[PDB]
Design a protein around this ligand. Structure first.
Ligand code: HEM
Ligand code: HEM
Lengths: 362, 361
């Protein structure tokens, strides 16, 4: 229930241990006033300092002027910080505004069209995003709600996604969670303690070409539907063949333990792990940080289930793009469909109480 | 960490309120009474495994390679999490299997209420399964697997996820707050109040339907909150709407959340005043609802609210009179009922040889 420090060279919510719940929102900007937008970022940063410490925004949730609406909407009163992190990102479409065209990072690449894509344009893109992660879903919603409230008239929510449970791990010492296909998901990821691997694969560096992004990262979000009727009638051997690990232990095929190293030549040529492994992609490595979702029924008598896939990397051109290109023959494709997509540049951390979100860009 | 599955009553009504909910309504696709009873027995066997934290059938792995696993496996490694599974039968079930004359009179159709805007696709249903647990993945795995076992005899009509408190971080005796920011549940029937449960919640044999003795009647309402409108209202307006202050949750004029309210000090159309038993001839409900947030609609607004669940001994003397009295609720400006269903919840599974619905079938 403890707090995650908000200040740092990097934003929390990336290398941070993966919290239980996600409320992810993408925002479109509705003002053309750069000064008004900078004021918003500063106001949002101040609110984030309160929210991530478990305090109410502004002057609080009650005890103010009776005839005024309260500063904070109040539904998190008496709750712990619950490991809340708030991570902000800037979308490519943002750089068409406030004269930022020449500051768009080269590493903020538009994604190509991939085979099988069925992207809903309404639930894709966005000028900016806020990823709210916490162990208490009420804490995460409260944070999104109050940020949106503070930004009224300057930003509007384009789309949002709740994740009811994590399907990722940045802490290999703790149990690996399972996704809705029933397999452990997160075994060979980057751990928050592997400082050298994060510098190598996750954090943007000064020499990479965009100085304001130094210490930031790049985020790919993909909303992925799972064909669970199709999956649930597949045999056990089929399911394990698709991945190359067994279902129970999550060990690489042939081996005894989850964390034994995969021997790829023992997996089928189209097994997901074989195709996604860094060794199959010239070393490309990702920090996966996704969550499961379910949005009611599909109107056809079945549950609607999916995975909200999130990957952080140092350069989208060298991370998600080559790996996803290599998944064109993935056996898993028979069971999933990508239906939403967005990329963001995640700026560096808020250094101290005088700093603010996006200060190095603006 | 686990709640007993067997008893005189089904668990999940008077037992401690868990952190998370997955509620699903199903429609029956078979005309065959024997096939439906077979499914009820199969479901009961699965619920016994699920509520003890085991996989269904022969497990999630380790069986024949060329067969699909009995359990879909996404709860492997998780704890029971206080999972309860509560089944209910909807009025439309009783048009099948020759059951028309066994529908309890207490399972009344709800009237139309002023301001209803019910989405037909998220209303009704032949039966429901209420899955409550502290871990949402344990709840979802339960519904997922019951639906899979029933495939070909039932389909899922609609599904609702909900949350309450997070118990690992919130004290047990602290009242949770709903998404309007007010404490919710102060004056409610508690599972410890055995006499009030007998009076207001459990069906009795003398009530007129013998197969329902020990059961209860459930009303579900999906209630959207107009969040953005509410958040623009003054603090005084919000407290005037309920009749309690926002910080402490105390009735107006009193000091502590649990002071008994003085109704005359509240505005005439304040929510607590209109809902109180003294304003409804003694009518008293067991509220066991959950907050929901499903996303944002097409206009950018928060799709969020209260998934209202009330248990009562007779729908005609519980939910109906109180909801009727809310016709002029000041709260109506800020909410809208958009889904509805009622269910008869049968008595409990008495022992290892009993099964869901045995008293009816
Ligand atoms: C619903 C969609 C997906 C599911 C169910 C899924 C599932 C899994 C599973 C079970 C594993 C093995 C355990 C682990 O090491 O995490 C895995 C590994 C991995 N997946 Fe996926 N995955 C999905 C989508 C993706 C996508 C879209 C990408 C990249 C574009 C990706 C990249 C990877 C990588 C890089 C690994 C680690 C491989 C290694 O280095 O051993 N996954 N995934
Ligand atoms: C979004 C919809 C609703 C919200 C936000 C809401 C909220 C509240 C709040 C804050 C209280 C005061 C604290 C408490 O005693 O729990 C309360 C009391 C109560 N509410 Fe509601 N309520 C809603 C809908 C309903 C409905 C639909 C009914 C019945 C049909 C109902 C019946 C009651 C009752 C019986 C009480 C207890 C009154 C007493 O005995 O003091 N509520 N509600």
């Amino acid at each position: 229930g403890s707090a995650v420090p908000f200040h740092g060279a990097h934003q929390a919510g990336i290398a941070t241990p993966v919290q239980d719940r996600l409320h992810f929102a993408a925002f479109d900007v509705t003002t053309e006033d750069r000064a008004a937008f900078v004021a918003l970022l500063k106001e949002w940063t101040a609110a984030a300092r309160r929210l991530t410490a478990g305090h109410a925004v502004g002057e609080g949730a009650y005890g103010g002027l009776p005839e005024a609406p309260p500063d904070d909407t109040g539904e998190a009163l008496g709750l712990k910080p619950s490991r809340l992190t708030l991570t902000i990102g800037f979308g490519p479409s943002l750089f068409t505004r406030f004269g930022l065209a020449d500051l768009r990072p080269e590493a903020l690449a538009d994604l190509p069209k991939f085979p099988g894509d069925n992207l809903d344009r309404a639930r894709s893109g966005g000028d900016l995003c806020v990823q709210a992660c916490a162990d208490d879903p009420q804490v995460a919603v409260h944070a999104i709600r109050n940020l949106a409230r503070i930004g009224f008239g300057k930003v509007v929510v384009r789309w949002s996604q709740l994740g009811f449970g994590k399907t990722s791990s940045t802490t290999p010492d703790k149990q690996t969670p399972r996704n809705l296909l029933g397999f452990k998901d997160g075994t060979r990821n980057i751990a928050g303690t592997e400082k050298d691997r994060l510098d190598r694969f996750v954090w943007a560096a000064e020499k990479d070409g965009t100085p304001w992004m130094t210490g930031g990262s790049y985020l790919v979000a993909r909303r992925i539907r799972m064909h669970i009727e199709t999956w649930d009638r597949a045999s056990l051997q089929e399911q394990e063949d698709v991945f190359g690990r067994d279902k129970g232990e999550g060990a690489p095929v042939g081996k005894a333990k989850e964390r034994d190293e995969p021997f790829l030549k023992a997996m089928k040529p189209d097994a997901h792990v074989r195709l996604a492994h860094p060794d199959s992609n010239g070393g490309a490595t990702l920090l996966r940080r996704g969550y499961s979702f379910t949005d009611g029924t599909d109107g056809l008598g079945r549950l609607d289930a999916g995975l909200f896939f999130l990957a952080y990397q140092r350069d989208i051109r060298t991370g998600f793009v080559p790996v996803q290109r290599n998944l064109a023959t993935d056996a898993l494709n028979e069971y999933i469909q990508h239906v939403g997509s967005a990329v963001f540049a995640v700026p560096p951390g808020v250094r101290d109480a005088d700093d603010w979100w996006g200060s190095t860009l603006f």
